[model samples]
Every structure is written in C-alpha cells, then in structure tokens.
Target: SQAEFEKAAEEVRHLKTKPSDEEMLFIYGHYKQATVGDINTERPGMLDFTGKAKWDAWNELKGTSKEDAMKAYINKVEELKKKYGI
Candidate 1:
C-alpha cells in the first residue's frame, strides 16, 4: 500500500545511522520516482555536485513504475533498519 510505503520512507530517516552516500542515492532514486513519477527537468550544472548527483540518481529510474519504486524503497528501508539496528 502507498501508506506503508510512505511510512517506510519516514522510517528510513530515523535510522540509527546515516546510510552511506551510495545507499542514500539509491534510496533517493526510488523515493523521487515513487512520489514524482519520473524525472522531468534539466540536469543541474556540472559544478552543482549535489544537485547533479541527485538528478542523475532519479533519472536512472526513468521507466520504473511508481508501485515498484515504492516497494523497492520499502525493502531498502527494512534492510537498513536491520543493518543499522533502527
């Protein structure tokens, strides 16, 4: 359900430890795809490191269905929960 998915998104933020940069980018991809559907804007300037990385991450999931993205996001959160003892 979307509700469960939303809860998982929230839960990830409260994990005992911050996820690694790679893991976080993976999470961000799914979260944005789940909620925003797909990337629709231009890529950020090359000098905008954070923005470009985030944009690239979300863009990587170009055609994933929202439901699938939500499920993936939830699964990742659960994995992080156990790994981080959240």
Candidate 2:
C-alpha cells in the first residue's frame, strides 16, 4: 500500500547515517515526485543553495507516475537502510 511505503520512505530523512549528496538528490527527486506529483514550480536560481540541483533531479523524473515514484523511493530507502545498518 502507498501508506506503508510512503511512511517507510519518509523515515529516510531521519536515518542515523546520512545519505551522500548524490544519493540524497536521487531520494529527493523520487520523494518530491511521489508526494507532490511532479515538479510544479519554477527552477531555483543559480545562487540558490542546493535548490536548483534538487529541482532538476526531481524534474528528471518527467513523466513517471506518482505511484511508481513512491515505490522507487521506498525501494531506495530500504536499500539504504540495509546498507547503513541503522
């Protein structure tokens, strides 16, 4: 169910071991696409602190269905969880 996966994926943010910048960007993209249903806002400016990269990564999902994004996010979260071991 979406609730199960979404809730689990949300835990990624609270993981003890931090995800790397690149992995986080991937997570951010899938998470945003899953929760917000695709990128809907303007691109963040050049000077924006990490916002542009985040927005771009999310936008890369393009036409992915929200449900699919949610699954992908959950899968990545679980993988990270196993890899990090706490």
Candidate 3:
C-alpha cells in the first residue's frame, strides 16, 4: 500500500457519479475492507436485497489483508476511470 491509496479513494468517492452494479459492489467490498479492516457485523435481514448483496460483497473478502485491499481499491479506481474516459 502507498499514500496514493487515499488519493485513489478520494477520486473514486467523488470523481464518478455512478458505477455499474458489479463494479460498485466490488469497490464497496474492497474499500470497506481497506479502511474498516473487516466485516464485524451480522448480515442484513432476509428482505433487504441491496443490503444483503453488499454484505456478501464484504464477506467475500474475509481473507484479504488491509494492505492488499487498499492496493486493489486503488487499482479498481484507476481501471474504472480509464474505462469511463475520465
């Protein structure tokens, strides 16, 4: 991980207005792990489809280290920016 991680976080948080469903979920998972470390709470309620999806996204990253998560988050933002021609 590097200082650029924060910069990339900032860019992804504000530079883009929207993200495709898959990409958004992917970013949410990695970014949360990068900053918050891991998923510490229970999964969402049965009726909460959106919340359940996001919760699963984070849960899938259980084995990832924070440093690795941060690096991945940075790479994702860069790729998304390029894909969007930003």
Candidate 4:
C-alpha cells in the first residue's frame, strides 16, 4: 500500500529533525501499520521495558486501514510542526 515512493513526500517535508527513541517507536508503529499491516507479533518478554513500550505503542493503533493510517500520521506530524515549529 505504501508502494508509491512519493506518496509521503509532502508529509516528509514536515520533518525537520530526528525523533527520540521513545517517540521513534511510536512513529515506527504508525508507519508500519500504514505501509505493511497490523501488529501480529506476540507480546515482548514481560521484563523487557523497551520492547514492551514499542509493542504497546503499536497496539494502540489496533487495526487502522493502511491509507487511513498514513493520512492520520500526516495529520499528527503536521499538527505538531504547525504548533511548535518543530
């Protein structure tokens, strides 16, 4: 569904810098579900804090449609960029 290399071009322009590890995983989840599909992996080891957080973030997305999720993601970053100029 994310085949078009230029599909996210305008959305990409909004990114002016890098994201933190915490923020990074959330972004990964949104992009993944938009590009590939839903989260089907098993829960991470209970003691694994980082993995748990990543899984949790993706799980939050549930089963959003690919095209819908992509636009939703665009809205998110654009909102932040528009507000804080970040």
- Residue 56 C-alpha lDDT in model 3: 94
lDDT by residue for model 1 over 1-86, one digit each (tens)?
A: 78889789789989998889989998999999999998999999959999999999999999999999999999999999999977
Q: Each candidate: how many clashes?
A: 0, 0, 0, 0
For candidate 1, the TM-score is: 0.94
Per-model TM-score versus the true fold? 0.94, 0.87, 0.86, 0.63
Where does candidate 3 stray beyond 4 Å?
Answer: 14-17
Put down candidate 3 lDDT per residue, 16-39, tens digits, no spaces. Answer: 457799999989999889988889
Clashes of 3: 0
Candidate order (lDDT): 1, 3, 2, 4
Instruction: Give the clashing residue pairs of candidate 1, or none.
Output: none
Displacement of residue 2 (Cα, Å) in model 3 is 4.9
Mind giving the per-residue lDDT tens digits that candidate 4 earns over 34-84?
Answer: 777688888799599888887888888887987877776666666545644
Error of 1 at 45 (Å): 0.4
Candidate 2 lDDT by residue in tens digits, 1-86 = 58867677667867778888988998989888888887899999869969989998999998999899888888888888887765
TM-score of 4: 0.63
- Report model 3's TM-score to 2 decimal places: 0.86
Which residue pairs in model 3 clash with each other?
Answer: none
Better of 2 and 3 by TM-score: 2
